[PDB]
Design an enzyme around this catalytic site. Structure first.
Site, PDB file in Angstrom:
ATOM      1  N   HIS A  25       0.829  -1.226   0.000  1.00 55.12           N
ATOM      2  CA  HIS A  25       0.000   0.000   0.000  1.00 55.12           C
ATOM      3  C   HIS A  25       0.856   1.266   0.000  1.00 55.12           C
ATOM      4  CE1 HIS A  25      -3.176  -2.890   1.311  1.00 55.12           C
ATOM      5  NE2 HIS A  25      -3.844  -2.161   0.432  1.00 55.12           N
ATOM      6  N   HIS A  28      -6.296   7.210  -3.209  1.00 53.08           N
ATOM      7  CA  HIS A  28      -7.336   6.328  -2.597  1.00 53.08           C
ATOM      8  C   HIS A  28      -6.809   5.587  -1.376  1.00 53.08           C
ATOM      9  CE1 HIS A  28      -5.428   2.900  -4.591  1.00 53.08           C
ATOM     10  NE2 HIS A  28      -6.222   2.079  -3.932  1.00 53.08           N
ATOM     11  N   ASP A  29      -5.489   5.465  -1.237  1.00 57.14           N
ATOM     12  CA  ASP A  29      -4.858   4.728  -0.115  1.00 57.14           C
ATOM     13  C   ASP A  29      -3.882   5.625   0.641  1.00 57.14           C
ATOM     14  OD1 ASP A  29      -5.923   2.064   0.158  1.00 57.14           O
ATOM     15  OD2 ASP A  29      -4.642   1.360  -1.486  1.00 57.14           O
ATOM     16  N   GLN A  51      -5.578 -17.920  -2.838  1.00 54.58           N
ATOM     17  CA  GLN A  51      -5.684 -17.105  -4.078  1.00 54.58           C
ATOM     18  C   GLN A  51      -6.841 -17.595  -4.940  1.00 54.58           C
ATOM     19  OE1 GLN A  51      -3.396 -14.247  -5.292  1.00 54.58           O
ATOM     20  NE2 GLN A  51      -3.833 -14.362  -3.132  1.00 54.58           N
ATOM     21  N   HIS A  71       1.604   1.543  -5.716  1.00 56.72           N
ATOM     22  CA  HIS A  71       0.218   1.005  -5.831  1.00 56.72           C
ATOM     23  C   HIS A  71      -0.697   2.123  -6.356  1.00 56.72           C
ATOM     24  CE1 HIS A  71      -3.591  -0.939  -4.864  1.00 56.72           C
ATOM     25  NE2 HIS A  71      -3.867   0.094  -4.061  1.00 56.72           N
ATOM     26  N   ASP A  99      -8.383  -1.059  -8.259  1.00 53.90           N
ATOM     27  CA  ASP A  99      -7.739  -1.401  -6.982  1.00 53.90           C
ATOM     28  C   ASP A  99      -7.163  -2.802  -7.011  1.00 53.90           C
ATOM     29  OD1 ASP A  99      -6.820  -0.729  -4.473  1.00 53.90           O
ATOM     30  OD2 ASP A  99      -8.879  -0.876  -3.599  1.00 53.90           O
TER      31      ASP A  99
HETATM   32  O1  LIG Z   1      -4.641 -11.605  -3.201  1.00 54.08           O
HETATM   33  C1  LIG Z   1      -5.433 -11.260  -2.322  1.00 54.08           C
HETATM   34  C2  LIG Z   1      -5.869 -12.162  -1.343  1.00 54.08           C
HETATM   35  C3  LIG Z   1      -6.790 -11.713  -0.450  1.00 54.08           C
HETATM   36  N1  LIG Z   1      -7.266 -10.448  -0.454  1.00 54.08           N
HETATM   37  C4  LIG Z   1      -8.243 -10.015   0.452  1.00 54.08           C
HETATM   38  C5  LIG Z   1      -8.269  -8.699   0.914  1.00 54.08           C
HETATM   39  C6  LIG Z   1      -9.282  -8.243   1.786  1.00 54.08           C
HETATM   40  C7  LIG Z   1     -10.292  -9.130   2.163  1.00 54.08           C
HETATM   41  C8  LIG Z   1     -10.259 -10.448   1.666  1.00 54.08           C
HETATM   42  O2  LIG Z   1     -11.233 -11.334   2.059  1.00 54.08           O
HETATM   43  C9  LIG Z   1     -12.410 -11.338   1.294  1.00 54.08           C
HETATM   44  F1  LIG Z   1     -12.194 -12.294   0.283  1.00 54.08           F
HETATM   45  F2  LIG Z   1     -13.533 -11.773   1.975  1.00 54.08           F
HETATM   46  F3  LIG Z   1     -12.566  -9.971   0.990  1.00 54.08           F
HETATM   47  C10 LIG Z   1      -9.251 -10.903   0.819  1.00 54.08           C
HETATM   48  N2  LIG Z   1      -6.923  -9.606  -1.379  1.00 54.08           N
HETATM   49  C11 LIG Z   1      -6.019  -9.894  -2.290  1.00 54.08           C
HETATM   50  C12 LIG Z   1      -5.700  -8.859  -3.285  1.00 54.08           C
HETATM   51  C13 LIG Z   1      -5.406  -9.127  -4.604  1.00 54.08           C
HETATM   52  C14 LIG Z   1      -5.207  -7.916  -5.235  1.00 54.08           C
HETATM   53  N3  LIG Z   1      -5.355  -6.950  -4.354  1.00 54.08           N
HETATM   54  N4  LIG Z   1      -5.656  -7.495  -3.103  1.00 54.08           N
HETATM   55  C15 LIG Z   1      -5.859  -6.740  -1.926  1.00 54.08           C
HETATM   56  C16 LIG Z   1      -7.030  -5.990  -1.777  1.00 54.08           C
HETATM   57  C17 LIG Z   1      -7.173  -5.233  -0.599  1.00 54.08           C
HETATM   58  F4  LIG Z   1      -8.274  -4.463  -0.418  1.00 54.08           F
HETATM   59  C18 LIG Z   1      -6.209  -5.233   0.417  1.00 54.08           C
HETATM   60  C19 LIG Z   1      -5.049  -5.957   0.245  1.00 54.08           C
HETATM   61  C20 LIG Z   1      -4.893  -6.733  -0.916  1.00 54.08           C
HETATM   62  F5  LIG Z   1      -3.717  -7.463  -1.040  1.00 54.08           F
HETATM   63 MG   LIG Z   2      -7.490   0.825   0.533  1.00 49.92          MG
HETATM   64 ZN   LIG Z   3      -5.650   0.287  -2.880  1.00 51.93          ZN
END
Ligand SMILES: O=c1ccn(-c2cccc(OC(F)(F)F)c2)nc1-c1ccnn1-c1cc(F)ccc1F
Ligand SMILES: [Mg+2]
Ligand SMILES: [Zn+2]
Length: 313
Positions: free
Chosen positions: A68, A106-107, A269, A72, A217
C-alpha cells in the site's frame, strides 16, 4: 500549454494496455501520471505547476510499506486511465478529472493494516470512522492536501463543479472498501440482468464508478503472471505483518494473515479469484464491454495459480 509530456516509445505504446507495469524507476512515476491526465483529461484540465505540486505532496503522504505505497497508487491510476481511454464517450469532463485523482489518492497514509486490525487495536481512527475506517481517512487526507497553499488543482472550477468533483472523489475512495464491493456488484448484476441499468440515473453511475474503482484497486491480478506473482509477495508481506500484530493482541489471525500457514497461499488465491476478482471483472465487462482484457488476464492468472497447486509450478 505547449509542453506535451512524452514517454519513450516502448512505454508510450505499452501504457495504453490494461496490463502495463509502471516499472521500478520511481522518479518516472509522476511524469507517467501527468502523461495520463493530459491524454485522458486534456493539457488544460490542470495548471501544470499546481498538478506537479499536488502529486509530490500526495507522494510524500504515502508510507514505505510493502504493498500500500506510492507505486500502488500510480498502478491503480493507470488501470483507470486504460478504462477511461477504452470508454471515451461514456464519462463526463468532471468524472475523468476526479477519478484519476481519486485513484492516486485512494490509499493515502495507509499504514499497511486492515480496518479490522484498527478496530481490534482500538485505534483513534476507529473511533473517528466506525465503518470504512481507512477509506474515510484517505479522503480526509486528500481534502487536506487540496487545501495546502498552491495545491488546489480544482481552482478554475465553479462552486457547483467543485462540489460535484469532491463528491465523485469521496464516493470513489469510499468504494475501495472491499466490504462494500460485494453488495454493490450484486445490485449491478441484478440491475444489468433485469435491464433496469440506466447510466443517466446518477445513483446508477455512482455504483458503476464504484465497481471500476474495485477493478482498478485489484488490478495486480490482471497483469502478466510474473508481475502478478511478484506483487503477491508484497501483498502477503503486509498480511503476515498484520497476522503478527493480531497475535500480539492475543488473537489468532485468519489463515490468510498467518505466516505459519504459508503452504495455503495458492488455495487462498483461488478463493479470492473465484469469490472476488473474477465476478468483479465479469460484471465490469458486461457493463463496459471494452474492459474484457481485464477479465481475460484475470482468468489466465487463475489458471497459473491452479498450475501452482498441481505441482506444475
Ligand atoms: O490476493 C489477495 C488475497 C486476499 N485479499 C483479500 C483482501 C481483503 C479481504 C479479503 O477477504 C475477502 F475475500 F472476503 F474480501 C481478501 N486480497 C487480495 C488482493 C489481490 C489484489 N489486491 N488485493 C488486496 C485488496 C485489498 F483491499 C487489500 C489488500 C490486498 F492485497
Ligand atoms: Mg485501501
Ligand atoms: Zn488500494
Amino acid at each position: 500549454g505547449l509542453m506535451q509530456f512524452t514517454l519513450p516509445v516502448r512505454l508510450c505504446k505499452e501504457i495504453e494496455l490494461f496490463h502495463f507495469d509502471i516499472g521500478p524507476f520511481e522518479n518516472m512515476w509522476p511524469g507517467i501520471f501527468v502523461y495520463m491526465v493530459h491524454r485522458s483529461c486534456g493539457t488544460s484540465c490542470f495548471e501544470l505547476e499546481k498538478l506537479c505540486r499536488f502529486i509530490m505532496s500526495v507522494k510524500k503522504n504515502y508510507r514505505r510499506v510493502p504493498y500500500h505505497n506510492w507505486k500502488h497508487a500510480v498502478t491503480v491510476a493507470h488501470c483507470m486511465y486504460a478504462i477511461l481511454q477504452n470508454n471515451h464517450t461514456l464519462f463526463t469532463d468532471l468524472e475523468r478529472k476526479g477519478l484519476l485523482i481519486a485513484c492516486l489518492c485512494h490509499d493515502l497514509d495507509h499504514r499497511g493494516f486492515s480496518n479490522s486490525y484498527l478496530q481490534k487495536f482500538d485505534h483513534p481512527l476507529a473511533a473517528l470512522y466506525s465503518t470504512s475506517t481507512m477509506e474515510q481517512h484517505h479522503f480526509s487526507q486528500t481534502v487536506s492536501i487540496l487545501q495546502l497553499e498552491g495545491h488546489n488543482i480544482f481552482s478554475t472550477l465553479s462552486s457547483s463543479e467543485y462540489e460535484q468533483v469532491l463528491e465523485i472523489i469521496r464516493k470513489a475512495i469510499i468504494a475501495t472498501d472491499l466490504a462494500l464491493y460485494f453488495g454493490n456488484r450484486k445490485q449491478l448484476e441484478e440491475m444489468y440482468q433485469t435491464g433496469s441499468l440506466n447510466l443517466n440515473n446518477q445513483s446508477h453511475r455512482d455504483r458503476v464508478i464504484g465497481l471500476m474503482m474495485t477493478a482498478c484497486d485489484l488490478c495486480s491480478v490482471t497483469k502478466l503472471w510474473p508481475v502478478t506473482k511478484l506483487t503477491a509477495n508484497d501483498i502477503y508481506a503486509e498480511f503476515w505483518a498484520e497476522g503478527d500484530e493480531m497475535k500480539k493482541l492475543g488473537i489468532q489471525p485468519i489463515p490468510m494473515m498467518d505466516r505459519d500457514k504459508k503452504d495455503e497461499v495458492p488455495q487462498g488465491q483461488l478463493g479470492f479469484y473465484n469469490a472476488v476478482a473474477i465476478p468483479c471483472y465479469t460484471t465490469l465487462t458486461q457493463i463496459l464491454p471494452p474492459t474484457e482484457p481485464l477479465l481475460k488476464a484475470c482468468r489466465d492468472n487463475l489458471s497459473q495459480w491452479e498450475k501452482v497447486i498441481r505441482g506444475e509450478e
